[PDB]
Design an enzyme around this catalytic site. Sequence first.
Site, mmCIF file in Angstrom:
data_model
loop_
_atom_site.group_PDB
_atom_site.id
_atom_site.type_symbol
_atom_site.label_atom_id
_atom_site.label_comp_id
_atom_site.label_asym_id
_atom_site.label_seq_id
_atom_site.Cartn_x
_atom_site.Cartn_y
_atom_site.Cartn_z
ATOM 1 N N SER A 33 31.185 49.826 35.292
ATOM 2 C CA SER A 33 31.312 48.661 36.174
ATOM 3 C C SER A 33 30.425 48.735 37.416
ATOM 4 O O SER A 33 30.348 47.737 38.145
ATOM 5 C CB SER A 33 32.775 48.466 36.576
ATOM 6 O OG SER A 33 33.569 48.179 35.427
ATOM 7 N N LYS A 70 27.903 45.945 37.576
ATOM 8 C CA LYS A 70 28.228 44.599 38.038
ATOM 9 C C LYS A 70 27.374 44.245 39.261
ATOM 10 O O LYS A 70 27.200 43.083 39.583
ATOM 11 C CB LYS A 70 29.723 44.474 38.337
ATOM 12 C CG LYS A 70 30.564 44.472 37.058
ATOM 13 C CD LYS A 70 32.027 44.201 37.334
ATOM 14 C CE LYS A 70 32.825 44.082 36.045
ATOM 15 N NZ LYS A 70 32.837 45.345 35.297
ATOM 16 N N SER A 94 36.987 44.202 39.030
ATOM 17 C CA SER A 94 36.127 44.719 37.969
ATOM 18 C C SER A 94 36.431 44.037 36.635
ATOM 19 O O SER A 94 36.731 44.672 35.618
ATOM 20 C CB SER A 94 36.270 46.236 37.871
ATOM 21 O OG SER A 94 35.064 46.810 37.431
ATOM 22 N N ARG A 142 38.228 58.886 43.246
ATOM 23 C CA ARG A 142 36.850 58.455 43.480
ATOM 24 C C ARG A 142 36.624 58.115 44.946
ATOM 25 O O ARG A 142 35.712 58.646 45.589
ATOM 26 C CB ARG A 142 36.538 57.245 42.601
ATOM 27 C CG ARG A 142 36.632 57.532 41.102
ATOM 28 C CD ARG A 142 36.487 56.252 40.285
ATOM 29 N NE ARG A 142 37.553 55.294 40.579
ATOM 30 C CZ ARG A 142 37.656 54.108 40.001
ATOM 31 N NH1 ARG A 142 36.759 53.729 39.093
ATOM 32 N NH2 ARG A 142 38.646 53.303 40.340
HETATM 33 O O1 LIG Z 1 38.678 51.303 39.209
HETATM 34 C C1 LIG Z 1 38.192 50.809 38.167
HETATM 35 O O2 LIG Z 1 36.976 50.893 37.833
HETATM 36 C C2 LIG Z 1 39.131 50.045 37.266
HETATM 37 C C3 LIG Z 1 39.174 50.293 35.898
HETATM 38 C C4 LIG Z 1 40.054 49.593 35.091
HETATM 39 C C5 LIG Z 1 40.899 48.644 35.639
HETATM 40 C C6 LIG Z 1 40.882 48.384 37.009
HETATM 41 C C7 LIG Z 1 41.803 47.393 37.616
HETATM 42 C C8 LIG Z 1 43.150 47.672 37.823
HETATM 43 C C9 LIG Z 1 43.944 46.711 38.418
HETATM 44 C C10 LIG Z 1 43.395 45.508 38.787
HETATM 45 C C11 LIG Z 1 42.053 45.307 38.547
HETATM 46 N N1 LIG Z 1 41.253 46.221 37.976
HETATM 47 C C12 LIG Z 1 39.989 49.094 37.807
#
Ligand SMILES: O=C(O)c1cccc(-c2ccccn2)c1
Length: 242
Positions: free
Chosen positions: A47, A50, A95, A227
């Site tokens: 991601s 992006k 993301s 992270r």
């Molecule tokens: O930190 C990341 O890269 C990531 C990966 C997978 C999912 C999500 C997520 C979880 C809740 C709401 C929005 N997006 C974030």
Amino acid sequence: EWQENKSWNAHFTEHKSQGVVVLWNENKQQGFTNNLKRANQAFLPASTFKIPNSLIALDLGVVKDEHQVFKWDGQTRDIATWNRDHNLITAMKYSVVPVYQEFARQIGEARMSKMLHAFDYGNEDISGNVDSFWLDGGIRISATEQISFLRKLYHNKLHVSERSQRIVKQAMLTEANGDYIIRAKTGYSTRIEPKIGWWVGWVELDDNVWFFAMNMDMPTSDGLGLRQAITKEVLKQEKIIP
Ligand SMILES: O=C(O)c1cccc(-c2ccccn2)c1
């Protein structure tokens, strides 16, 4: 010039992990890392891609502006925040892969390939499916290569309009207070080994900017919060943020 401080490895090993942090002091034009080798190893961007994808979508008119609504396609996915309408700001924040997969389909292979070459982005290789190559195709980028790309974006030097670059930097906004501003993007690569998490971006201060790029082993999603937490701990250790 670059300096390696292997003692910073403790930030990762204390969590039973391994990774790299890369820092760049823009005023002094100096870089710092715990591991020069891993700083130059190339991984799937996942991601973090992006950022370039948004730039290309905006500059070609695939995306009109940061208010345009991308309607949920009605397919229930396992991330609750993806099952709703988004604009560029919220699609970045959560993301939202399926929104960016549609961007890439409308961009198309030829224009995507050309633009990544113009950006000098990673290995510039989009082999795979046009709507998933940043997740399981041939594109790769290193932490130092992320820094090089981010510096161009900061200075409005990428080969897209100033407007496109300003809008993406708005969408990267992650944190701001009286002491600093962070513009960044997370990434989570799982479809090819090794599974890693990314955080890339920069810290704006009153009179300097510090660019950063980090990745770390991520065998399960339980460690994703590390992270940002580890990176900010390095920044605090180096007295970049309070
Ligand atoms: O930190 C990341 O890269 C990531 C990966 C997978 C999912 C999500 C997520 C979880 C809740 C709401 C929005 N997006 C974030």
